[PDB]
Amino acid sequence: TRSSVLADALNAINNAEKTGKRQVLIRPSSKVIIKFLQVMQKHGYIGEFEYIDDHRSGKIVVQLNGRLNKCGVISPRFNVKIGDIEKWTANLLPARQFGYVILTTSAGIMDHEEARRKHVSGKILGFVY
């Protein structure tokens, strides 16, 4: 049974990038998925994406430009303190400034650098690099 829709979306995006497809279909959609994709969009790893409404959970179509090396979800969503962020960046990213660790903090879903600037913390959703 479906446990994490975000995991399914990120896996579909990774597979589509691997195969060289220029665009991918993600089903079902969600607010968390849309915010994650918006973070990736802000950092340029993905292009334009369009949400299709069918009176159900919904669907998404994402344009891919081939700039994405990897995107993943960290399940379970561990509670991350401000001190503990650097540990996660060391563990998940191939280098220090290569990629981003995305957190759902009390101020929204954001990359770890924005979290450090805003001095917030929360749970960890995944990473993109």
Partner 1 sequence: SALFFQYNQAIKPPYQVLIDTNFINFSIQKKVDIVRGMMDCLLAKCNPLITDCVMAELEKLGPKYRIALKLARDPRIKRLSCSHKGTYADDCLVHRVLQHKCYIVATNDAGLKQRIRKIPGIPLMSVGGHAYVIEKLPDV
Partner 2 sequence: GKGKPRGLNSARKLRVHRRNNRWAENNYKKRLLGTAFKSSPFGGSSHAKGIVLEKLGIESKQPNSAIRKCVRVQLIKNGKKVTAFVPNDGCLNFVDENDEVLLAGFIPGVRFKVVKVSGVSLLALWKEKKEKPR
Binders of RNA: how many residues, by CB under 7 A? 14
β-pair partners for 64:
none
Residue in 77, 85, 91 with CA at minimum distance from that of residue 111: 85
CA angle 119, 73, 67 (to 5 degrees): 90
String of contacts with partner 1 for each residue 47-76, x by CB under 8 A: ----------------------x-------
Q: Does 98 bind partner 1 (CB under 8 A)?
A: yes
With CB under 7 A as the contact rule, the residue among 7, 14, 21, 32 that binds RNA is 32
Closest to RNA by CB, 67 or 78: 78
CA distance 101 to 127: 4
Q: How far is the CB of 124 from partner 2 (least distance, A)?
A: 11
Give the binding range for partner 2 (CB under 8 A) out of 24-32, 34-42, 53-61, 76-84.
76-84
For the record, the structure tokens of 85 come out as 């962020």
Binders of partner 1: how many residues, by CB under 8 A? 8
With CB under 7 A as the contact rule, the residue among 22, 42, 87, 118 that binds RNA is 87
CA distance 81 to 71: 22
Q: Does 94 bind partner 2 (CB under 8 A)?
A: no
CA distance 24 to 91: 28
